[PDB]
Design a binder for these strands. Structure first.
Length: 47
DNA sequence: CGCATATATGCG
DNA sequence: CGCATATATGCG
């Protein structure tokens, strides 16, 4: 299923929720630190 | 990693 | 909304 991943940022205290794709805040965090980091901070949500 | 499908924002 | 760009989940 198109499971939601919540992501949270140790450096800003911001949070997101996405099922994937080109998403604004999620793309900034990949720019700022990296996709490995960004995925490692994730959480799985059944939604 | 490459393909398929649903998701997700921006250019037009 | 059509398309480009990107990207999770799932098949293989």
């Amino acid at each position: 299923a198109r499971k939601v991943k919540q992501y949270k940022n140790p450096h800003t205290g911001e949070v997101i929720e996405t099922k994937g794709g080109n998403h604004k805040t999620l793309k900034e965090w990949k720019a700022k630190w990296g996709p490995e980091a960004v995925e490692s901070w994730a959480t799985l949500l059944g939604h």
